[PDB]
């Protein structure tokens, strides 16, 4: 139990290190919209990804998720791109072993680049959607 | 101050998810190497690059830190690997606004693309050196 994961620790730490940089600098109302998105985080976005997942530890089947978050962002609406970037979130919390730190890249890199300009608008607008339909 | 930087605050969320998914996973020691990366990372690899990141708010310039790291896994060293790590992990404090999440992502696909398959095992050698060196 002595072997060392490097891709996993190495993964960890940085994505650590710049999640604290950029919380600090965040804005108020940015820190609610980070909330509002763990909070629809918990809402499973693919059950037959999470089940699928569940099984194994083909690289076909890995490029799912990727196909599914740009069919997503596709003429797309605020709800499909805070659906996008949940399901990546979930597929984060599978993709942990350095083998699949490959996929997992790959799908966040599919999801930000595949973003519309309206998504700083966007956001700000799902923001306060689900703000005053269920506050 | 209602203005909201989609690109910052979604890499913020899925950058914390991850990080805290695979942090559950890891070993004992693997979690000794965590910290230790910590602490090495308080270690500035660049100066230059903190001065000049200082300023500002080229890309040509955006692209130095990816061909340091690409020069320090060229024939490598464990040393040189954690340097690469150290150096993307202080780039990721200086890049936090939305539109420098380009460069970095892209620095950190460059880290993890050139690493060595001895990794795993330059990683545990160069954590048992700092212990031993330090302890
Ligand atoms: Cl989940
Ligand atoms: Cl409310
Ligand atoms: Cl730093
Ligand atoms: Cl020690
Ligand atoms: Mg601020
Ligand atoms: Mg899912
Ligand atoms: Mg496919
Ligand atoms: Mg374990
Ligand atoms: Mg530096
Ligand atoms: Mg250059
Ligand atoms: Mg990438
Ligand atoms: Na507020
Ligand atoms: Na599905
Ligand atoms: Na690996
Ligand atoms: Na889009
Ligand atoms: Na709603
Ligand atoms: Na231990
Ligand atoms: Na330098
Ligand atoms: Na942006
Ligand atoms: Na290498
Ligand atoms: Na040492």
């Not at 690289?59 to 799912?64: F, K, L, R």
């Not at 083998?99 to 966040?108: A, K, P, S, T």
Request: glycine share 6%.
């Amino acid at each position: 139990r002595d072997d060392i994961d490097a891709s996993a620790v190495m993964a960890a730490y940085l994505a650590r290190e710049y999640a604290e940089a950029v919380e600090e600098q965040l804005t108020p109302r940015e820190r609610d919209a980070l909330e509002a998105l763990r909070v629809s985080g918990e809402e499973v976005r693919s059950p037959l990804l999470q089940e699928l997942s569940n099984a194994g530890e083909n690289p076909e089947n890995s490029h799912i998720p990727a196909a599914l978050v740009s069919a997503l962002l596709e003429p797309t609406s605020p709800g499909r791109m805070v659906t996008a970037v949940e399901l990546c979130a979930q597929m984060g919390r599978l993709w942990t072993r350095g083998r699949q730190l490959v996929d997992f890249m790959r799908l966040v890199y599919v999801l930000l680049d595949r973003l519309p300009p309206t998504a700083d608008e966007d956001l700000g607008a799902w923001l306060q959607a689900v703000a005053r339909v269920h506050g």
